[model samples]
Target: EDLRLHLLLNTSVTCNDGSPAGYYLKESRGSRRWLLFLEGGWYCFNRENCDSRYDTMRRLMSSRDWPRTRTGTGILSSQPEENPYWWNANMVFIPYCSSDVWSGASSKSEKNEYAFMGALIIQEVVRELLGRGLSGAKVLLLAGSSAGGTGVLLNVDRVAEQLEKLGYPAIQVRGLADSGWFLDNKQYRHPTEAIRRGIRYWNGVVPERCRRQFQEGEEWNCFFGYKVYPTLRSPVFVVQWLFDEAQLTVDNVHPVQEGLRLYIQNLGRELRHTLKDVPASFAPACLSHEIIIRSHWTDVQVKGTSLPRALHCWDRSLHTPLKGCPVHLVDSCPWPHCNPSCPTG
Candidate 1:
């Protein structure tokens, strides 16, 4: 309810074709804790997609019709009864504008009159927040939904590094990526073209930074959450659905009877394997896209463990591995295609 706008004068826009980028802040009084949530829609990899994106209010290309106000819901809610632990924490909502999953480094598109400055947008926003009060915050949670979730996994360490450099070396910084642990299928491998487009259009420098872990011509793979997992230093919790509608669509695993079940199972195995070293995760058998935004956020559980409880237990461990299993994979749906409620590509 206390939403206030904070714009980046430099990266928010440049000239005629830049997207309006900034953050909305809601100050807290109980503590110095902070919750930074990145907004997500998706991305535009080509001139046609980028051009089509600008036509709707989904992706911001100008401030002329930007939503100047917002009411927090789900995890962003200020009501203590809604989000018990984070209700009083200072909240920051970073809007997506660069159309590159907040990973692009380019200033603008050469083929079209659109801006691709997502990398700078986040850098400047974090810098501004640190100067405000986050520099001394005792606790911080970086989170996002959908593409924003992917952004959190991508930028969490960067933010932690920035905090340390800003004189908050001892502050606790954790991350939660909801429905964004994208894995490149071993079979189809269609994301290659999309990743290549991101690299060329957005001028992403992910490959250069993550070069030590990957090989030549595979830099685009850096966009995948699993590919970036090995390089992450901070603790993160990935919340995903095994039969994710979005992932199934992207992987093209529809119109099959026996193959669909194997696809979801394979996806689950890949996700767990890739994030085996990650601090925490919740992989449910539900056929959904994003968590944390649903009405049953608190009630939703996997293996009798709720997401909130899992996060609490993980934090209680001081980010160290617990004595028992840290992974929780719940098998709810009998088969991928059996339930009509289950989504399809």
Candidate 2:
């Protein structure tokens, strides 16, 4: 089963810090039901407008809601939030990337990259799992997206270590990342520029220093070359889009991708990795802010159909069905036959 398919939406979980964090889950159908985690983007709690920031994430997970369609014939039950789709059918959703890391209110501080806040969220999930009676034996997928994606990519090794300490063999984990800003490697305007941007966008609610601690942790840098944890024996499906106007073509993706490629090449190590690079979904060629919202749904094969036109910059199209979509990866270079060439692997 494709990691892109079979997604779940996670809500709040009780963390060791006794705080609540959100998370999402999904399982591969073919003996690959290892759990998956999706990381969120830059804005937290929609500091940039929750309605706008979360629309895509929500739409993507909503696919698991029950009452499966003729094309959505995957699982049995789903926690249908919007429509009666079979989204929650075979997986779970946890919201770790969209909550407060500083103080109590929802803050979107970049400084809080992956230190206290991210750790607390991981704790919360563990607590909930133990509280709900799930053991490591039953746990399979473990993945994340964006900063949350960074969370999984960087911390999976740590999580594996912690699980071993707790006498649980590390469970099989998969990964998926959407548009995240923290993974870039280029030097920014300032060490705290990303945090400051968070404060401004999050309505001056995010704590600057709290976020700084996260950056200091070097977790964000690990994606590039900080070297935090040892490599693992697992399969990670990396989904990246080049047209990510906010981060890729606009920000620091080139340097970051360069660093990552160099790291892998230098190691001469084999990592069971499948990189599904896709085209930018939006940000039209003519306008700076105007983005292409819809594309061919990559899930299903359609002769000729496209995603609903992307109207708003951060519209909720994640829920757009892939029943008849084209396939594209986020990390690939532009090719003439990109749309059709995307799903072959």
Candidate 3:
């Protein structure tokens, strides 16, 4: 299962800062199925941050700096012992280039700077994949990690609609969001100006999308997954940790703080409150941010249940129940042995 990466011919400065943009395609001999994975790196809000990204040549900042080569991992692993259920499924890995959460709707800037345009990038890449044998997929799964996870949640319905119009009969489309369930922090008085500025900088159409679910004044609420989840029409799976490290540390809240714990509890409560529509979720009590793309993917468990097995059950039946910390459950001080073993940023 050697995977080779291929750059998209349509890539340009407007799309990915004139950097190389591509996806790794591993064609399966057994099924007309496809899995599209959107890669993730955090974001750059203002010109200063964005410019720093470009200047530094970070992976998500410009495609030129990204690995022109890549291999499968986690669910995309070609090894039979790793991801047995989807070992033979066609897989496409879309690299993250735009600073937006793969939801930017704008092109280059007014000052001749590179615009985010992550949304358009997704459309173009999907079209290119369709031309490359994705049009006949029987089961199309859209998945991503971190920022890309947010992308899957945001674009799943739109992508599914676009594919359905291709006229494939009985096509099944599903989405998985890994560690990307961003919570609305307005109530908690946490800072959202960066995100609000992000929506503006990326020209994200979050307001327009949120309009369908809330009043005009609440359009800013769309920046968080909890606010956007109930509005999504497609069945989606959410994989996250009870104590997301990034959400805590990057936001200036220490993991050991009571505020951080409360924030985590609030997020869990919100997810549980919306579980009637969400297909399934996995919220293990780990002190990590992202999942499904790490070594822990194989061993982490909740109540004796492994992720791959839980995901297999989720894929087979909509009735698969959510597995994670109980509502309002709080971890005691020191966080047990899990904290020391957690990966550092």
Candidate 4:
């Protein structure tokens, strides 16, 4: 089924610029499962950046130009062959407009000229979904890529808690975060600083437990997935590239240098160290970013098991009641391009 647009005009929900916020929905009459994906984009840490984003990437910060309809691709695909595990599930695509990595909690104020309400947007979307059959949802997989992936880590627990409070305690909420896992190191100072500044600019919302551990101004530390992961209660599956180009680019590193080989090698080690107890993860030693939204999403493999295959097993094991599943498909080979199945183009 093709995904159709649905705008929420009655609510207080709005984009960064006070435009009405909305999401795309594709329902499956026979299934009670849901896969809500948050779209990813660059974050604005200050008023200047937000202003720049509005001029350049207006669609991400405003809904005025959103299309009447959109076709799903990759995991959002309705075709059973491309999206084998979730083809028949009710799918939702929540576009990113908050520019806060979907962590904002404050609304647009008259003096502020912009709103930081990404976190609230997700809640509003869920509240609206409840009226449209989510009340009977058996499973809810909240997934995202890049910044939106970080959004999943920051908001997945709250989503589960919200559902329980809303009288749907039976719905199983899980998180699938792709390329959202970030490491804090010397090379990350640039991006890390930006995130720290963004938390204040956006008045970000993080999991309560994680937020409680930090001091007043230092609370921005919870913005990273690694910091938020420890406090997450729901089951989460992390999908990250061993050598993330996104992280590298954010720090303005020139990968053409000879030192890049060493950089790539160290990247894998840092990723492996951080993902040791992720519970369920797929870390491919490839030099790319996200894959769940890629056409060949099922083509890449870790230890011979593809991503979709591992995700299927992960879902099956959860339903099987404590049955062990080997979905922690990390690449043992630390070098770049070690996986033969990875796409070269």
Candidate 5:
């Protein structure tokens, strides 16, 4: 046994409410593979919103009530049925306690009532786990969902760079982001402007190359996965619904709205375009927010390939490129809720 099921973080690391952060862990003896997932609960954009969130703090702001023992889901599942591959590997859940989409970098200060250290918390979790089982890991998949899916996009490059800088260069870091991608939309103008202010309020970090391509104030573009995807140096697999329910709801639109048929159609077209070069991805033409946590997430498929099958194929392509091993998978149908495997909403 490497370590127990749970452990509170060290003194230096703290969550949104200034309490010590923590993570859940489970290990398989003699396994070198690791899946470290960042939890997602969305985020508050500005200081005022963040303070209000603090006043109503829960697990998203602090880890006081987190269960000592935990169960995993989807890719985190130890069962071979749900998680076809990587089931026997060590698993760790990095809880989301900061309402910053796990990208904030600010420490506690008079500028705000709480510390917004989402990015730091992630890095510190990796640092603390090195001694447990990460130090000798071979393939480390940095996985996340929703905001944390975007967290995977935002922090994967940084995590890999950090590992290399920390003398763990032997470890190969990869990313698996679930329903984290979004399109530039009408009602909200996408998260570009929202996250621009978020960077100011949360002192959020952006990727290096993406940040370099933009003007100083415009570096917030990196926070948008579509914008930063081109700059990421790491291998990332995106699992995004063509008509993401969350993106639609946030923008005040719904697929059920008959008049919005064009919206859904164009969304699929644009997402297909955006993901054109994404060699390892699964873009289902459905209207679901997130599914990686679902017990039967593998049921969702595209191009006659189940999500899990596509994932396994992608994994195989990582080291070998047999032409039939398909990694880039997207639904040809452009209609919402068109998939037979889609769960009824």
Candidate 6:
């Protein structure tokens, strides 16, 4: 079934948005709701077999995999070119023409490549969901272990607003990051500082001075722009990594934990200021304790408990249970070998 479906989907091009990347749904059968995982940095999936390490960590959908269902990846663009790091613009296209990263060429052109990637991946996922007739089942989630996680947190507003404008009736959106860099002040500031750094990085990667033009914009951190909550229209979750806590403190003027809390609180205040009610207390930070621990991203089940869902776990609690657990067709079964007898599988 996997081979047959892969060939079938490959034979047709239902979605060709002039994108250089590709999308793959599981070869198995399940509901249309999806969990789109976008890889960070200069990484692309192994084109041959998605199960390969080259693929994003989230297991793909396939016949051997069921009940725990997922559509693995959408279009993932080119990774950072591996030319000499000092080669500059002629080598790095991101800062040259598409200057939009954080550590590229210039200080004023601090273009955060990951954030832009997140925006694109999310749009593609929503398009995939609409193509599959998923409707509002497109309760989307953005997650990552390290820098990718930071991308989710930093760009939550960008992702949510885009989804909202797509005429999406609703999206039970959640964003989570482990060892994130967005909350740190030294690498990037929330509103003005971030854009300044982005400009700097963009200019540094290339030798463009006109790229120094400062655009009056607010990042998700600002109360007036998408950085604010009513504008974001989505829940936020900050997963603090034990190891990265030091970076969060030293890099930022304050602790990362405090910075995150203040960020959400500011959004809550903004939501109340505009809507007359802080209808959502959705931002919750959980301590994952381990830096690269397996249990951090793992899922644990709590069946028939008084808890919100039949299955629950700390690591998976990025957002509160809005649409309910198994919200999308999450794959809970163990991989490779599946024993129906196992409680988890």
lDDT of 1 by residue, 1-345 (tens): 556776666654531156457888888866678888877777878878777877774435554455677677667778866665477788888777777777776655566577777666766777888777877688788888888888887788877877788777877888888988887775433466887877777766552357566766667777788778667778887887766777777887555555655766777666656655555787776667787755447766666666767766766676445654444434444445333333333
Give the per-residue lDDT of model 4 (tens digit) for 1-345.
378888885457889988988999999989999999999977888888789999999999999999988888888888889987788889899999999999998778876789888999999999999999999999999999998899999999999999999899999999999988887666733366888888888888888888888767777777777778888899999999987888778655643455766676777888888888877899988888788877679788888888887888888778722344477888878776887876686
Residues 87-188, model 5: lDDT tens digits: 788988888888887888877666666777888888888898898889989988999999889899989999999999999998999999988787656763
Q: What is the C-alpha lDDT of each candidate?
A: 0.70, 0.33, 0.68, 0.85, 0.81, 0.31
Cα lDDT for residue 61, model 1? Answer: 52
Order the candidates by TM-score, highest first — what do you get? Answer: 4, 5, 1, 3, 2, 6
Q: How accurate is candidate 3 locally (lDDT)?
A: 0.68
Q: Give the TM-score of candidate 1.
A: 0.86
**Which structure among the candidates has the greatest TM-score?**
4
* Model 2 TM: 0.44
Backbone collision count in every prediction?
0, 65, 2, 0, 0, 33
TM-score for candidate 3: 0.84
Candidate 5 residue pairs that clash: none
lDDT of 1 at 272: 56
For candidate 5, the TM-score is: 0.93
Best prediction by lDDT = 4
- Ranked by lDDT from best down, the candidates are 4, 5, 1, 3, 2, 6
Q: Write the residue-wise lDDT of candidate 3 on 52-71 in tens digits.
A: 88777566766665555577
TM-scores, all candidates, are 0.86, 0.44, 0.84, 0.95, 0.93, 0.40
Candidate 3 deviant stretches above 4 angstroms = 12-16, 109-112, 186-191, 207-209, 215-218, 255-277, 318-345
- lDDT (tens digit, per residue) of candidate 6 on 145-222: 343444444455555666678777576555543344333232325223434444333321211121122223323233
Error of 4 at 335 (Å): 2.3
Model 1 residue 331 CA deviation in Å: 4.9
Question: Candidate 6 clash total?
Answer: 33
Where does candidate 4 stray beyond 4 Å? 188-190, 255-258, 320-325
Q: Is candidate 3 or candidate 6 better by lDDT?
A: 3
